[PDB]
PDB file of C-alpha atoms in Angstrom:
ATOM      1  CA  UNK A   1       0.000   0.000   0.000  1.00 29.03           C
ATOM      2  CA  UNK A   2       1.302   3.675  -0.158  1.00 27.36           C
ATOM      3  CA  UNK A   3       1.545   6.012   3.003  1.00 26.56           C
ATOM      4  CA  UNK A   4      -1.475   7.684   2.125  1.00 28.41           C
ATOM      5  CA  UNK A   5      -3.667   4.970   2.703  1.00 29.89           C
ATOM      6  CA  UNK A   6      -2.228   4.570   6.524  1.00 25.83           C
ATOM      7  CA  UNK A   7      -3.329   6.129   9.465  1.00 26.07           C
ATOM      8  CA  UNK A   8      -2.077  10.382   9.601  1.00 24.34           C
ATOM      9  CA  UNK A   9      -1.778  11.548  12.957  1.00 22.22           C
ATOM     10  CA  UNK A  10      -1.791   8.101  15.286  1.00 19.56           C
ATOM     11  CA  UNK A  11      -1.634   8.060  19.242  1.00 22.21           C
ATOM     12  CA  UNK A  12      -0.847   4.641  19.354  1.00 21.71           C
ATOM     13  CA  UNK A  13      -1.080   4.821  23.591  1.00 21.65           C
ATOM     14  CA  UNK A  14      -4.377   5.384  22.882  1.00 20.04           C
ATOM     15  CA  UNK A  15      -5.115   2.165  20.837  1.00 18.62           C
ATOM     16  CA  UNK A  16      -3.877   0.550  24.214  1.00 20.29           C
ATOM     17  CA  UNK A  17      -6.597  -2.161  25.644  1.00 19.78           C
ATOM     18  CA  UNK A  18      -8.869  -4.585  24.650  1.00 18.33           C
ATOM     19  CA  UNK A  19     -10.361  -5.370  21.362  1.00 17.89           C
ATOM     20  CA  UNK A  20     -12.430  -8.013  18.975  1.00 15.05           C
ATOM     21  CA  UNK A  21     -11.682  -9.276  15.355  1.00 15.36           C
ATOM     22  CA  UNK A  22     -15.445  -8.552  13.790  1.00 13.30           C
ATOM     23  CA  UNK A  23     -14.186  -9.058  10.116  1.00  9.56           C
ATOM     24  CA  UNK A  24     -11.558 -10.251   7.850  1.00  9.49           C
ATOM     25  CA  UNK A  25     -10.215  -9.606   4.733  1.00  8.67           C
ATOM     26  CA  UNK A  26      -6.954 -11.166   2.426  1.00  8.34           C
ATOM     27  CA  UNK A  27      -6.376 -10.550  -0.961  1.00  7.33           C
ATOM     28  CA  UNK A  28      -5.906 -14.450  -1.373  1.00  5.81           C
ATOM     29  CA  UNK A  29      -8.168 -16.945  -0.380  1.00  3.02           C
ATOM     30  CA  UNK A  30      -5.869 -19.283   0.712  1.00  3.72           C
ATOM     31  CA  UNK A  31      -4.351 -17.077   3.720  1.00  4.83           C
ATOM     32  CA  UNK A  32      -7.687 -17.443   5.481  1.00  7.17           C
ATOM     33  CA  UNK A  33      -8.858 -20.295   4.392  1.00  9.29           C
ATOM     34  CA  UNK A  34      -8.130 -23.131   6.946  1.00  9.22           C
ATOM     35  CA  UNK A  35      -7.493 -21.685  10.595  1.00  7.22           C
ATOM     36  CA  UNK A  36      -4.235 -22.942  10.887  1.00  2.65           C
ATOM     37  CA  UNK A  37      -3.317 -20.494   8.439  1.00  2.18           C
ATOM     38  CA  UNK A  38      -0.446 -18.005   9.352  1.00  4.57           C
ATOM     39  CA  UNK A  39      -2.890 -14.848   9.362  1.00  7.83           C
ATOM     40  CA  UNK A  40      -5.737 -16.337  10.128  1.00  8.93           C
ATOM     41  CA  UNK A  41      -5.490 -14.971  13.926  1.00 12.55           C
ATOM     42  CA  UNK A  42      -7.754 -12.751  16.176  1.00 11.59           C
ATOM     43  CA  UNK A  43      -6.666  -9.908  18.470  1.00  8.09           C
ATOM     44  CA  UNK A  44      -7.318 -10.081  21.650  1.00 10.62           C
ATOM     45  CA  UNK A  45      -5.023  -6.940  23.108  1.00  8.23           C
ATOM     46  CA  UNK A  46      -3.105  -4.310  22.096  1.00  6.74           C
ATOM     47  CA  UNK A  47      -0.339  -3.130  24.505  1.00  8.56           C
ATOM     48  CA  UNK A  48       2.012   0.060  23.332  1.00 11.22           C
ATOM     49  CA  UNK A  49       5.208   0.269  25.031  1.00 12.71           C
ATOM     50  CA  UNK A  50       6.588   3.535  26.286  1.00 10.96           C
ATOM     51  CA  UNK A  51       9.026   3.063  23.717  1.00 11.39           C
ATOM     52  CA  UNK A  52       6.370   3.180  20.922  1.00 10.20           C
ATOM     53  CA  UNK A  53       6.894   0.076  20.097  1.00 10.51           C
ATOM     54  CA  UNK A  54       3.351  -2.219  20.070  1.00  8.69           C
ATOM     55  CA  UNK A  55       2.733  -5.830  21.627  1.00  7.89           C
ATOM     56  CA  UNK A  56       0.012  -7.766  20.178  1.00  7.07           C
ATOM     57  CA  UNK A  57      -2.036 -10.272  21.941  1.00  7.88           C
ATOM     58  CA  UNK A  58      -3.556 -12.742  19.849  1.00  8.34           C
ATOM     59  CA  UNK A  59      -5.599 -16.053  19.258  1.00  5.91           C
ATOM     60  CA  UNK A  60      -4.838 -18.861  16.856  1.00 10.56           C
ATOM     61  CA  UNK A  61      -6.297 -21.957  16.363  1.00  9.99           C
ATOM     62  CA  UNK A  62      -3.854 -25.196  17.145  1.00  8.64           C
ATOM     63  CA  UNK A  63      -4.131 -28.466  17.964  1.00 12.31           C
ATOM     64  CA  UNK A  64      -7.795 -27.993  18.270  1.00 11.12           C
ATOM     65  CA  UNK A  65      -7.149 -25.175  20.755  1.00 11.55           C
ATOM     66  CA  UNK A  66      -7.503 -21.782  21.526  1.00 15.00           C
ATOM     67  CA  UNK A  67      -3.710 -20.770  21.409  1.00 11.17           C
ATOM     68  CA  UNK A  68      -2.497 -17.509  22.941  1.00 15.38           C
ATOM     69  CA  UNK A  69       0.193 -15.537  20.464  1.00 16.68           C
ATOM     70  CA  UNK A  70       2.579 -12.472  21.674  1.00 20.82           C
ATOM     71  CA  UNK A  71       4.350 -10.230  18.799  1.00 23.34           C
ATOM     72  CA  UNK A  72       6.104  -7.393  18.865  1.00 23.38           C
ATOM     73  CA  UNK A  73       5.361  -5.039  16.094  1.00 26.15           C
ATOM     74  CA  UNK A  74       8.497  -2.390  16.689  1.00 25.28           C
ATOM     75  CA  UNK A  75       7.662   1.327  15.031  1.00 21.51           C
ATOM     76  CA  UNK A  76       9.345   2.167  11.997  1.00 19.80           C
ATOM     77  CA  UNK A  77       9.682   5.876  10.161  1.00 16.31           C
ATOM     78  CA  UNK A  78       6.509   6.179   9.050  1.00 17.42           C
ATOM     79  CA  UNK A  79       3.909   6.633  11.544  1.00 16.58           C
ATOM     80  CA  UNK A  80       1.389   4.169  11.289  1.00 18.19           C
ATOM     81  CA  UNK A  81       3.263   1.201  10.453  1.00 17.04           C
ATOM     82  CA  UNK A  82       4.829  -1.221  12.527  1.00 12.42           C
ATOM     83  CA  UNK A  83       7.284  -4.246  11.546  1.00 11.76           C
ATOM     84  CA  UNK A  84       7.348  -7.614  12.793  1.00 13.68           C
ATOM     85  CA  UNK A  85      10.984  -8.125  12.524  1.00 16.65           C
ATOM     86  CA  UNK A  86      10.318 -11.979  13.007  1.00 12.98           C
ATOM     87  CA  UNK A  87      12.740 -14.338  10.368  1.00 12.43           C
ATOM     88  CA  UNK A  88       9.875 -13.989   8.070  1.00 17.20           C
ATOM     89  CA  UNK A  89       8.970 -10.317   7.882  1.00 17.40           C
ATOM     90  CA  UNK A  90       5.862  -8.622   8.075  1.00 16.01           C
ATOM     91  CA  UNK A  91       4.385  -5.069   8.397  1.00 17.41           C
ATOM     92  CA  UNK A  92       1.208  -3.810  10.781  1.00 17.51           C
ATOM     93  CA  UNK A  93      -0.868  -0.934   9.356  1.00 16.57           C
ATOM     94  CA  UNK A  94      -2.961   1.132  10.795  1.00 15.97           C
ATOM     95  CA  UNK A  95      -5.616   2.293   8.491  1.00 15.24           C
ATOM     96  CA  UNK A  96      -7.842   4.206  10.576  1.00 14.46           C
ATOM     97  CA  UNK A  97      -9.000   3.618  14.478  1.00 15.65           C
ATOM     98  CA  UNK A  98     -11.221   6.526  16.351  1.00 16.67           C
ATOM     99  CA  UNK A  99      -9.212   5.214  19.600  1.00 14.86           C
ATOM    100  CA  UNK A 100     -12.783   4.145  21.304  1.00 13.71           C
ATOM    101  CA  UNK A 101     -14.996   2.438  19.481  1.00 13.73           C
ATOM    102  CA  UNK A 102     -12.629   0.641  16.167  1.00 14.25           C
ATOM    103  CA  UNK A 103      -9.569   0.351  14.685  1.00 14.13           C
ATOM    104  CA  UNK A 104      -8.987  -0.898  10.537  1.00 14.43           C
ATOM    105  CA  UNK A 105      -5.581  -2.304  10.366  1.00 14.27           C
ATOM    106  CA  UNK A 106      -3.934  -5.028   8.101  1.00 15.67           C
ATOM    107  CA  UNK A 107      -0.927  -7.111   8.119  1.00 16.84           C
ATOM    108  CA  UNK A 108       1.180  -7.167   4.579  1.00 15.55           C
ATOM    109  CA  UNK A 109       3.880 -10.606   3.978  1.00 17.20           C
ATOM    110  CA  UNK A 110       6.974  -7.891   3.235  1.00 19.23           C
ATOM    111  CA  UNK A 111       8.500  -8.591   0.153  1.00 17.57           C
ATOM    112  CA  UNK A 112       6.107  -6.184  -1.706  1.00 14.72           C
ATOM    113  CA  UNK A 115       0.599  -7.887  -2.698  1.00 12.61           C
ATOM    114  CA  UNK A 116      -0.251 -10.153   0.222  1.00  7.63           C
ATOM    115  CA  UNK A 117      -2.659  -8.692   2.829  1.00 10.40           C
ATOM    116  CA  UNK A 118      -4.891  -9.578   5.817  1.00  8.01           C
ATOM    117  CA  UNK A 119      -6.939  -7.006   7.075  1.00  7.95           C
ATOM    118  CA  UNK A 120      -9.077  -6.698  10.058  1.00  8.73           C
ATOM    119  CA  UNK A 121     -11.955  -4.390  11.510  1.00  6.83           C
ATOM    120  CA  UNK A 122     -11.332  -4.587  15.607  1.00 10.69           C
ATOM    121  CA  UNK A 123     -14.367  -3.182  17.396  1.00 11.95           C
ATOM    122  CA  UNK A 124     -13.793  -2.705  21.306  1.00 13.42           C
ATOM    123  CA  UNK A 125     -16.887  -3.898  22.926  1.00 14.13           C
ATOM    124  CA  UNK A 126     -19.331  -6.252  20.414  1.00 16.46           C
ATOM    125  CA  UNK A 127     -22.201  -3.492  20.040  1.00 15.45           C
ATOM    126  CA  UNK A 128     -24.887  -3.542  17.575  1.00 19.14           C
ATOM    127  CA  UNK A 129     -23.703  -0.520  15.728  1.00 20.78           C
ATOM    128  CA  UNK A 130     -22.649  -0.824  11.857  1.00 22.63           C
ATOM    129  CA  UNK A 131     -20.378   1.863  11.751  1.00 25.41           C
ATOM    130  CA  UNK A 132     -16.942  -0.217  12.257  1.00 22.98           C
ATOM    131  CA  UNK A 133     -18.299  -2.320   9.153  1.00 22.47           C
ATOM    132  CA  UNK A 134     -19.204   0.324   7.000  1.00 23.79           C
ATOM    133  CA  UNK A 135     -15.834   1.951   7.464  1.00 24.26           C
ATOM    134  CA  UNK A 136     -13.542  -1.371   7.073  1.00 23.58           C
ATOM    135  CA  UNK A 137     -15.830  -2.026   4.121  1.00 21.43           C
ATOM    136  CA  UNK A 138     -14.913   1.448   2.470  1.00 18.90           C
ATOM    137  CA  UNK A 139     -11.615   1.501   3.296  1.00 18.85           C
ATOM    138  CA  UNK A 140     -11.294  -1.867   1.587  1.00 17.10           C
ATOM    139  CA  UNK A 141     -13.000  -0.992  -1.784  1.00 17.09           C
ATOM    140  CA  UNK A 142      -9.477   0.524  -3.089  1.00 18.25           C
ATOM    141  CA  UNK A 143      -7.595  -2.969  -2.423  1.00 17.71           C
ATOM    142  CA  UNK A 144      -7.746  -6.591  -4.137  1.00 17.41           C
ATOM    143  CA  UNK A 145      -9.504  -8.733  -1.491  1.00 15.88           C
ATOM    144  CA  UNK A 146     -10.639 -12.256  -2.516  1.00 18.96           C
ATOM    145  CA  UNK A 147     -12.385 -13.607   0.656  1.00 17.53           C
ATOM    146  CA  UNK A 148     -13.777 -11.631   2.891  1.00 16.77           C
ATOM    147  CA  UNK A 149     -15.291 -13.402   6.480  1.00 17.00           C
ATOM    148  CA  UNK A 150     -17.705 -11.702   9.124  1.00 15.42           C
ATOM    149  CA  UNK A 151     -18.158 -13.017  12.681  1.00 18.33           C
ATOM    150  CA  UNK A 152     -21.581 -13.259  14.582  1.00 17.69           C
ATOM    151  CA  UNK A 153     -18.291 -12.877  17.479  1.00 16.00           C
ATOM    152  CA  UNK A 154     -16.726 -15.591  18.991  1.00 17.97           C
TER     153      UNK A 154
ATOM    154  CA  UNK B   1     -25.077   4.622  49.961  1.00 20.75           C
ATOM    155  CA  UNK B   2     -28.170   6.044  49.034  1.00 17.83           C
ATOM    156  CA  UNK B   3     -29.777   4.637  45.063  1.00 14.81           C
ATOM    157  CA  UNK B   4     -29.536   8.684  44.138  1.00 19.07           C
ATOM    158  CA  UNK B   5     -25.705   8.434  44.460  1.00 17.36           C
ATOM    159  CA  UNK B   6     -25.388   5.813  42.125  1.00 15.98           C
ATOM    160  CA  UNK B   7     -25.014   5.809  38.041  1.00 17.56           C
ATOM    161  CA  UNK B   8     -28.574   5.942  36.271  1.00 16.63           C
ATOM    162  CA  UNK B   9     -28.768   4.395  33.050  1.00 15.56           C
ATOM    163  CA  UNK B  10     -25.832   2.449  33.179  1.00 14.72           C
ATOM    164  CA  UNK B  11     -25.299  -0.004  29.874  1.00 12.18           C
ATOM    165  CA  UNK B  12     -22.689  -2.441  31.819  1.00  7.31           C
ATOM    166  CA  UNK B  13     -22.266  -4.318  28.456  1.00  7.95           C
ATOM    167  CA  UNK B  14     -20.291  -0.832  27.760  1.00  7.88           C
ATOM    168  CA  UNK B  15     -17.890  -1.228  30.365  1.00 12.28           C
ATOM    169  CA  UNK B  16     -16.149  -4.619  28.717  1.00 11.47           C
ATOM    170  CA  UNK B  17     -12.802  -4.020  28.553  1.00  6.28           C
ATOM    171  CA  UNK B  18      -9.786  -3.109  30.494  1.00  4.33           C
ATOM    172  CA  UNK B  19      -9.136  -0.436  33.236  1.00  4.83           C
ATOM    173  CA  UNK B  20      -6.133   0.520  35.153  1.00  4.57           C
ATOM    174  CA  UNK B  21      -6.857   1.540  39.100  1.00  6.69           C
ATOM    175  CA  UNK B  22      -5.585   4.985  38.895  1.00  7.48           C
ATOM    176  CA  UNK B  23      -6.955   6.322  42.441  1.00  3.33           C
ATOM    177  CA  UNK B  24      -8.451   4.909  45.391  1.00  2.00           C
ATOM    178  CA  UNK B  25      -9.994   6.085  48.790  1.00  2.31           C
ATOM    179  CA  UNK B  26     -11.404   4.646  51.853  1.00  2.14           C
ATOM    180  CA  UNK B  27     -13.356   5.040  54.898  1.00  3.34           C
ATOM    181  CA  UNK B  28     -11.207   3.915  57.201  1.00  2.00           C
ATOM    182  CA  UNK B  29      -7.077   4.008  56.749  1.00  2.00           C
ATOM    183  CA  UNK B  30      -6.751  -0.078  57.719  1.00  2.00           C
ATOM    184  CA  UNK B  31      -8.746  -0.948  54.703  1.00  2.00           C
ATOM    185  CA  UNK B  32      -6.313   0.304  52.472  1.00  2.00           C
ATOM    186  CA  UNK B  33      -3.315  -0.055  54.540  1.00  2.00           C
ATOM    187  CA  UNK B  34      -0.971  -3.063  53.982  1.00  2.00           C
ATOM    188  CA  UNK B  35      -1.467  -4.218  50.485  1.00  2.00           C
ATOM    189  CA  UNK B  36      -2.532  -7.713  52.474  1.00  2.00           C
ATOM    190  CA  UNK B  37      -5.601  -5.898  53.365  1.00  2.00           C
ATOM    191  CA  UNK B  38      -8.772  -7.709  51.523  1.00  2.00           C
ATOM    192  CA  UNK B  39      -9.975  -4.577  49.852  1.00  2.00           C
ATOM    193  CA  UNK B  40      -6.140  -3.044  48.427  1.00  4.17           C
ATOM    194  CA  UNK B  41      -6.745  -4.807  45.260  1.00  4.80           C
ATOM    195  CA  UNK B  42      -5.871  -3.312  41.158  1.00  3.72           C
ATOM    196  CA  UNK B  43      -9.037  -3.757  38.616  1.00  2.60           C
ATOM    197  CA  UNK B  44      -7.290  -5.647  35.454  1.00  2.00           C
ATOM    198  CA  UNK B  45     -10.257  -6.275  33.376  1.00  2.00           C
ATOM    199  CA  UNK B  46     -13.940  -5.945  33.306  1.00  2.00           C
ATOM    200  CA  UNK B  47     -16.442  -8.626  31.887  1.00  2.00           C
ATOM    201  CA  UNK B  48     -19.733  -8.154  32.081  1.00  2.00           C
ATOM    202  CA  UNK B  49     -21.703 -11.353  30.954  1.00  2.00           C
ATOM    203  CA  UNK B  50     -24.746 -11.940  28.399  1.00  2.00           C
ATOM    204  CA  UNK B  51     -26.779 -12.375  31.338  1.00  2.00           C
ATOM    205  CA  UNK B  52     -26.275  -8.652  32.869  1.00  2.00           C
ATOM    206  CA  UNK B  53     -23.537  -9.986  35.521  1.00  2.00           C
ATOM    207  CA  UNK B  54     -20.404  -8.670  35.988  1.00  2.00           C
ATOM    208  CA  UNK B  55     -16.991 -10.851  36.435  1.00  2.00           C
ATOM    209  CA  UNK B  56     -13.907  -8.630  37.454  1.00  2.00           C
ATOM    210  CA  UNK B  57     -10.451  -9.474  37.314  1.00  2.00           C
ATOM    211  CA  UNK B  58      -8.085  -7.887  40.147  1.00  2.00           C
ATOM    212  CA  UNK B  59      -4.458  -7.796  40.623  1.00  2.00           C
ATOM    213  CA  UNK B  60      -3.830  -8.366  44.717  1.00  2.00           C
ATOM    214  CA  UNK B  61      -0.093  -8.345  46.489  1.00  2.00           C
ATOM    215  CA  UNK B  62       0.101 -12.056  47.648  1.00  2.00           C
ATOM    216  CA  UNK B  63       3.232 -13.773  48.539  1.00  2.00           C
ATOM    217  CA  UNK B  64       5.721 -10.930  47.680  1.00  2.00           C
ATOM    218  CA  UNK B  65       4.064 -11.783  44.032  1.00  2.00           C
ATOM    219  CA  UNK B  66       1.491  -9.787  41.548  1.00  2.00           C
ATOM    220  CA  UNK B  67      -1.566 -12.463  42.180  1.00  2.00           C
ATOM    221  CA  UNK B  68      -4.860 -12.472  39.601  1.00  2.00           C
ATOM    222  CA  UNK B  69      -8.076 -13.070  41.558  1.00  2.00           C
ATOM    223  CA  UNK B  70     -11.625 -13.283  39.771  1.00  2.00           C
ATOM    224  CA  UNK B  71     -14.625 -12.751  41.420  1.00  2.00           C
ATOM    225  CA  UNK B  72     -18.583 -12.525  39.597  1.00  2.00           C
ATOM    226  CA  UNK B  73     -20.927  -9.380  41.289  1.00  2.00           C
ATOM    227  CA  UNK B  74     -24.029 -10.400  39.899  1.00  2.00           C
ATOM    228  CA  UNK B  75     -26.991  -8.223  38.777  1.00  2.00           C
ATOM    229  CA  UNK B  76     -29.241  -6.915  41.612  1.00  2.00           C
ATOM    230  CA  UNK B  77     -32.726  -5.050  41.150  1.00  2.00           C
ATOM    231  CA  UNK B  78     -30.859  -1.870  41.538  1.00  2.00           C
ATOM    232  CA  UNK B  79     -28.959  -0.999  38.621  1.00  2.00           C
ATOM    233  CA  UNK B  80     -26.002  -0.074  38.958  1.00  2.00           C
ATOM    234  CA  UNK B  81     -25.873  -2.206  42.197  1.00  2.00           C
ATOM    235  CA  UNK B  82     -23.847  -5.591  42.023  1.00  2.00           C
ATOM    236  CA  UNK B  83     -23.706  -8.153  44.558  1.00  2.00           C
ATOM    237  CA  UNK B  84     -20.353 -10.251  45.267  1.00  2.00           C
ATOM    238  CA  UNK B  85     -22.234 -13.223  46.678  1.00  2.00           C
ATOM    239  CA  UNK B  86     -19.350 -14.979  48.369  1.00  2.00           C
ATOM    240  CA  UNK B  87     -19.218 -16.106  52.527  1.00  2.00           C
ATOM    241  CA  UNK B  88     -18.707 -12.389  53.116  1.00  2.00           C
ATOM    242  CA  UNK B  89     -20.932 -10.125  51.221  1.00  2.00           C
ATOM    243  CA  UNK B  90     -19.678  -6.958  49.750  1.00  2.00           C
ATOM    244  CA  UNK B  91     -21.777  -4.926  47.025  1.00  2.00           C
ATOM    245  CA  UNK B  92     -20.409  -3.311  44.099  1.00  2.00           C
ATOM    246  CA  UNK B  93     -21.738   0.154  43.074  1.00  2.00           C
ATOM    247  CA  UNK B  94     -21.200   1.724  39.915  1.00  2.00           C
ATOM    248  CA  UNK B  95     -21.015   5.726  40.614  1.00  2.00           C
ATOM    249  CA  UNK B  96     -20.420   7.166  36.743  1.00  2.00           C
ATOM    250  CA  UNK B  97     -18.709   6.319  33.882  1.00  2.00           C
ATOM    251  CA  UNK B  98     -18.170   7.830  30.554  1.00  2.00           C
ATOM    252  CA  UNK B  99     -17.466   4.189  29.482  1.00  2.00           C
ATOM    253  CA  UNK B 100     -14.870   5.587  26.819  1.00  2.00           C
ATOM    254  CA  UNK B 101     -12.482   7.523  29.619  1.00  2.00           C
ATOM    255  CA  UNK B 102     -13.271   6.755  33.362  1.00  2.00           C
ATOM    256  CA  UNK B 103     -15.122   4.673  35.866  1.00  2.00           C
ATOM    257  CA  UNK B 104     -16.044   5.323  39.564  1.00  2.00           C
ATOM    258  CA  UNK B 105     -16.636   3.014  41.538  1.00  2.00           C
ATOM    259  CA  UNK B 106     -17.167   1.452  45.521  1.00  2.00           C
ATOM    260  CA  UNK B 107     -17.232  -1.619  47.102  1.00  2.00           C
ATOM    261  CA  UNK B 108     -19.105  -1.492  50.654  1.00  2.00           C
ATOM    262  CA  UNK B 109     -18.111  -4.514  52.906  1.00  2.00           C
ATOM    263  CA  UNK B 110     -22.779  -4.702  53.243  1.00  2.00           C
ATOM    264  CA  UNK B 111     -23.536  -5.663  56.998  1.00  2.00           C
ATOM    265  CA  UNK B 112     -24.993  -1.872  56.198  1.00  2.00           C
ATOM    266  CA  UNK B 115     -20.130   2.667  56.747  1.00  2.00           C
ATOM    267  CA  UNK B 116     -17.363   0.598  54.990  1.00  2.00           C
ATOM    268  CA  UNK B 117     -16.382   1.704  52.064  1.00  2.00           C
ATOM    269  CA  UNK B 118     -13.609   1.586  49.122  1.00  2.00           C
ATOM    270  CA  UNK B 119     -13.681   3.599  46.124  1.00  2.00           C
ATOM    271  CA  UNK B 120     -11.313   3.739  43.018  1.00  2.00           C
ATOM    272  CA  UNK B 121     -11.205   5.438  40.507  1.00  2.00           C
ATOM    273  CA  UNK B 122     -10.318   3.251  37.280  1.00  2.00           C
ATOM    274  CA  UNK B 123      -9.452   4.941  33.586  1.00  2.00           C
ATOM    275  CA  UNK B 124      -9.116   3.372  30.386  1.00  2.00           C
ATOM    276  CA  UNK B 125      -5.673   4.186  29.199  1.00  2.00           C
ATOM    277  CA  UNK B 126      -2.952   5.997  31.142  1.00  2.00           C
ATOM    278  CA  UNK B 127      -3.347   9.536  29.705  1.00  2.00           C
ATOM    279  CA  UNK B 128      -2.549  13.222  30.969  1.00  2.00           C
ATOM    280  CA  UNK B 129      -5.659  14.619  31.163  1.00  2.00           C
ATOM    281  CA  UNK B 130      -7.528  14.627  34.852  1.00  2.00           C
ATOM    282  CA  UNK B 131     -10.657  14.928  34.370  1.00  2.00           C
ATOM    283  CA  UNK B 132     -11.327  11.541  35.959  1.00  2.00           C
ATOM    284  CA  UNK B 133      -9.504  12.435  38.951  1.00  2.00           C
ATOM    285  CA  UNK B 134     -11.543  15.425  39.232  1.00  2.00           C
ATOM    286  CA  UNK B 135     -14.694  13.653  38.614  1.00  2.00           C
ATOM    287  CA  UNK B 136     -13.618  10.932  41.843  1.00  2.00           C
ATOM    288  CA  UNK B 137     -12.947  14.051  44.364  1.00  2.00           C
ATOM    289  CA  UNK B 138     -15.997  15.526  43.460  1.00  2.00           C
ATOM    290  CA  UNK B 139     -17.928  12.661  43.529  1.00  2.00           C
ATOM    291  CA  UNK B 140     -16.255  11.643  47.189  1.00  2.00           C
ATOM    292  CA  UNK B 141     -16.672  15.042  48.766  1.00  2.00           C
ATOM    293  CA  UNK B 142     -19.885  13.720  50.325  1.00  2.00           C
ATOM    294  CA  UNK B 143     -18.536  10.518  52.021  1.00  2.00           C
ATOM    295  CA  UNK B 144     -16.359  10.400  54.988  1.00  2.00           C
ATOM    296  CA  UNK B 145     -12.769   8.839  53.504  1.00  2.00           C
ATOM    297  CA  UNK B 146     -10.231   8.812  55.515  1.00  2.00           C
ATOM    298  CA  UNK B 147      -7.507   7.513  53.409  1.00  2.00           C
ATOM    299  CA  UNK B 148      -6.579   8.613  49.878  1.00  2.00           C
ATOM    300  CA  UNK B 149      -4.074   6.952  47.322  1.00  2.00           C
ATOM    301  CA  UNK B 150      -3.077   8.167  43.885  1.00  2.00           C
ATOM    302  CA  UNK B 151      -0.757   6.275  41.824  1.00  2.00           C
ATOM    303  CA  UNK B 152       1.777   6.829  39.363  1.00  2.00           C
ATOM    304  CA  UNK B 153       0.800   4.128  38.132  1.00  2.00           C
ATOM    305  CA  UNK B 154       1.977   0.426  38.095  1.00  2.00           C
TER     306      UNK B 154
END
């Protein structure tokens, strides 16, 4: 993606706290398809450091359990984006989040393409407003699967 | 407490999430004392469930260690008013929240005069508006112990 399609103007302390995966989106079936699927993962918890760095808490399906996941997405130059400097890289995005009600953000396999987004809402109200914004912000990108949860 | 000092129109599904203990006060100065005391103890997490109850997860000193405790106040016909139903009986009483920013809130060891109250926020900010709302809201009870942390 290009920088104008990021987050301008992110408090990422702010983002701090709990939150639920209410939608999906990859570009590629196949990184969503089965659960045990790399991407296929839900956040549970975001935690900035006072470093600005950001630790994600999430959940993954494995050996037909509810597995708990800790990264560490470390800031970068550009604000907004966040790399998961992991032997296989990948970048976190921040689309767009209004700090207290959702946050867009999606998760690119760095080499250049490949992309997992996700609408995070932080309490499961019956609002629309988190899906009508992930769904806008996702009509400029290739997405070939798209999955909505009645929340788990 | 009297039921005019308590939140009206609370939505506890709204309160989901988690809280950092930011302030607290007390009654009487043993309550809050040595961090053994049974009412010195850090809100985590809130969890209300689909049935209108309300499960809380505390951090309490135990053992020179960080211990998690998690105890269910269930629904009362008072909103607002939550009941910890355990051998001793303490009620929960939601004060005012903004959901997005703050929460007061006391727990009253009921036999019918002891009181703790803390004052919980949603992220660590700068702004003190929540710590103006809690000594407002306690200049009508009789405290005799206050805490404000720098947080842990």
């Amino acid at each position: 993606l290009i920088v104008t399609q990021t987050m301008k103007g992110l408090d990422i302390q702010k983002v701090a706290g709990t939150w639920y995966s209410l939608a999906m989106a990859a570009s590629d079936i196949s990184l969503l398809d089965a659960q045990s699927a790399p991407l296929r993962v839900y956040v549970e918890e975001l935690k900035p450091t006072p470093e600005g760095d950001l630790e994600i808490l999430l959940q993954k399906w494995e050996n037909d359990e509810c597995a708990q996941k800790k990264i560490i997405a470390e800031k970068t130059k550009i604000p907004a984006v966040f790399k998961i400097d992991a032997l296989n890289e990948n970048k976190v995005l921040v689309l767009d989040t209004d700090y207290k009600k959702y946050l867009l953000f999606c998760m690119e396999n760095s080499a250049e393409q490949s992309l997992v987004c996700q609408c995070l809402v932080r309490t499961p109200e019956v609002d629309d407003e988190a899906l009508e914004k992930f769904d806008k912000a996702l009509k400029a990108l290739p997405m070939h699967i798209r999955l909505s949860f009645n929340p788990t």
